[PDB]
Write a protein that holds these residues in place. Structure first.
Motif, PDB file in Angstrom:
ATOM      1  N   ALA A  67       0.826  -1.202   0.000  1.00 14.82           N
ATOM      2  CA  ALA A  67       0.000   0.000   0.000  1.00 14.82           C
ATOM      3  C   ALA A  67       0.867   1.263   0.000  1.00 14.82           C
ATOM      4  O   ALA A  67       0.461   2.305  -0.518  1.00 14.82           O
ATOM      5  CB  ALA A  67      -0.968  -0.013   1.190  1.00 14.82           C
ATOM      6  N   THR A  68       2.073   1.166   0.557  1.00 16.77           N
ATOM      7  CA  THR A  68       3.038   2.283   0.469  1.00 16.77           C
ATOM      8  C   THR A  68       3.774   2.242  -0.873  1.00 16.77           C
ATOM      9  O   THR A  68       4.086   3.294  -1.453  1.00 16.77           O
ATOM     10  CB  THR A  68       4.009   2.339   1.690  1.00 16.77           C
ATOM     11  OG1 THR A  68       5.050   1.364   1.562  1.00 16.77           O
ATOM     12  CG2 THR A  68       3.251   2.082   2.984  1.00 16.77           C
ATOM     13  N   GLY A  72       4.174   6.144  -3.530  1.00 14.77           N
ATOM     14  CA  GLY A  72       5.407   6.902  -3.290  1.00 14.77           C
ATOM     15  C   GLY A  72       6.509   6.293  -2.437  1.00 14.77           C
ATOM     16  O   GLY A  72       7.548   6.940  -2.228  1.00 14.77           O
ATOM     17  N   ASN A  73       6.314   5.070  -1.937  1.00 20.30           N
ATOM     18  CA  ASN A  73       7.393   4.390  -1.217  1.00 20.30           C
ATOM     19  C   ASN A  73       8.149   3.442  -2.132  1.00 20.30           C
ATOM     20  O   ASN A  73       7.764   2.284  -2.317  1.00 20.30           O
ATOM     21  CB  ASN A  73       6.896   3.678   0.048  1.00 20.30           C
ATOM     22  CG  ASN A  73       8.035   3.103   0.895  1.00 20.30           C
ATOM     23  OD1 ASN A  73       9.185   3.547   0.815  1.00 20.30           O
ATOM     24  ND2 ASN A  73       7.710   2.117   1.719  1.00 20.30           N
ATOM     25  N   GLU A  74       9.255   3.953  -2.661  1.00 22.90           N
ATOM     26  CA  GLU A  74       9.946   3.375  -3.807  1.00 22.90           C
ATOM     27  C   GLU A  74      10.253   1.873  -3.708  1.00 22.90           C
ATOM     28  O   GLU A  74       9.989   1.124  -4.655  1.00 22.90           O
ATOM     29  CB  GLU A  74      11.210   4.184  -4.093  1.00 22.90           C
ATOM     30  CG  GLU A  74      11.886   3.856  -5.405  1.00 22.90           C
ATOM     31  CD  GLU A  74      12.903   4.919  -5.784  1.00 22.90           C
ATOM     32  OE1 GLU A  74      12.477   5.970  -6.324  1.00 22.90           O
ATOM     33  OE2 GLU A  74      14.116   4.704  -5.524  1.00 22.90           O
TER      34      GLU A  74
ATOM     35  N   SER B 119      -1.959   4.010   7.955  1.00 26.91           N
ATOM     36  CA  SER B 119      -2.517   2.665   8.078  1.00 26.91           C
ATOM     37  C   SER B 119      -1.967   1.802   6.936  1.00 26.91           C
ATOM     38  O   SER B 119      -2.709   1.418   6.035  1.00 26.91           O
ATOM     39  CB  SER B 119      -4.061   2.726   8.064  1.00 26.91           C
ATOM     40  OG  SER B 119      -4.640   1.449   8.326  1.00 26.91           O
ATOM     41  N   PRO B 120      -0.649   1.506   6.965  1.00 21.69           N
ATOM     42  CA  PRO B 120       0.057   0.938   5.783  1.00 21.69           C
ATOM     43  C   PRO B 120      -0.219  -0.538   5.491  1.00 21.69           C
ATOM     44  O   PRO B 120       0.231  -1.049   4.472  1.00 21.69           O
ATOM     45  CB  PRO B 120       1.526   1.146   6.128  1.00 21.69           C
ATOM     46  CG  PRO B 120       1.551   1.047   7.647  1.00 21.69           C
ATOM     47  CD  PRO B 120       0.256   1.680   8.115  1.00 21.69           C
ATOM     48  N   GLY B 121      -0.955  -1.212   6.366  1.00 19.79           N
ATOM     49  CA  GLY B 121      -1.357  -2.606   6.118  1.00 19.79           C
ATOM     50  C   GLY B 121      -2.222  -2.786   4.877  1.00 19.79           C
ATOM     51  O   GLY B 121      -2.034  -3.735   4.113  1.00 19.79           O
TER      52      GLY B 121
END
Ligand SMILES: [Cl-]
Ligand SMILES: [Cl-]
Ligand SMILES: [Cl-]
Ligand SMILES: [Mg+2]
Ligand SMILES: [Mg+2]
Ligand SMILES: [Mg+2]
Ligand SMILES: [Mg+2]
Ligand code: NA
Ligand code: NA
Ligand code: NA
Lengths: 176, 189
Positions: A67-68, A72-74, B119-121
């Motif tokens: 989800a990151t 934007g979380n490379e 909430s990165p899950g």
């Protein structure tokens, strides 16, 4: 707002977790407005920061968060405090997660608070704990508490609950 | 760790998008492991805590949040820091607008704190965090939000806001983050 009457709960997706379209009448302080809101229910969770007052260290984990990765979380890799989704009771759940994610079977835990993390359109409530420690697809990061706090400033740690835990520990004076 | 997208299925896409994502992740040793995860993309947002050093007060807001109402918040009312979705605005433009729309205060200088995944899950949401001093003479209207929103504006002693975290009266992640950042800053001493 005060008066709330449910009109309709429509399931948009029950693939595994559930997405809803919820219609409710809300009475404004001023007037009845019908809201239609999308609500995502992936259940609740717990999280725990492990800290050692002797070494002045904390234990965090690093893992791929898709989800990151799409936002934007490379590398997708994210540094977080140990966490898991709850059928278990919060303390039961987080003791499982600690063993399963970090390898420490922890003794006494201290509960901090229960917080909704993304209330715009997600139900998720997180149970927050801290614990002292001694003695997968998840890397266990042991680091100086002083380095972790600095990682918040650079953006190396950029997870909501993880920042919340680290700031509590800092304000607690347990590591002083 | 090599990551490769295998399949992106759209589960829902009314305005925000729910995905089911199949991906391959390479382990230590070189082994490729297939995973599947639901990803909810509501876009990114920004939040701001307004504080007043003369009066030792903060401005927060209170509104109905259905997502909490269905999940243990009896009245569904939640005390939060002012916030809004970016909605194709850059974070500072977004947050300055949301502050006047929701609180009525037109703020001067802001301080950016950090940008956090909340909430990165299974949720994409990144939140840009701000603080700003407010003054009584910077209030142009009563706030209240926009469109179908009913937002109540709360001005209170900072020490009472802090007290409310311990009692559960404040129980919102982004709001607690901000209150604690302000506590640690000494700006309110
Ligand atoms: Cl990549
Ligand atoms: Cl590695
Ligand atoms: Cl309900
Ligand atoms: Mg986990
Ligand atoms: Mg808002
Ligand atoms: Mg707008
Ligand atoms: Mg709307
Ligand atoms: Na919605
Ligand atoms: Na939102
Ligand atoms: Na409301």
């Amino acid at each position: 707002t005060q008066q709330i009457t449910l009109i309709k709960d429509k399931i948009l997706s029950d693939n595994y977790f559930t997405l809803h379209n919820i219609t409710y009448d809300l009475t404004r302080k001023d007037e009845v407005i019908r809201h239609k809101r999308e609500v995502y229910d992936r259940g609740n969770g717990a999280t725990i920061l492990l800290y050692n007052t002797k070494k002045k260290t904390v234990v965090l984990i690093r893992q791929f968060r898709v989800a990151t990765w799409v936002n934007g979380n490379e590398s997708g890799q994210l540094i977080e405090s140990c966490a898991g989704l709850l059928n278990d009771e919060p303390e039961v759940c987080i003791r499982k997660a600690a063993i399963e994610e970090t390898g420490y079977e922890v003794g006494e835990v201290r509960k901090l608070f229960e917080l909704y993390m993304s209330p715009g359109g997600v139900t998720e409530l997180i149970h927050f704990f801290i614990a002292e420690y001694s003695d997968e697809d998840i890397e266990v990061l042991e680091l100086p508490f002083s380095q972790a706090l600095e990682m918040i400033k650079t953006g190396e740690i950029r997870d909501g609950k993880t920042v919340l835990l680290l700031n509590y520990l800092q304000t607690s004076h347990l590591m002083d």
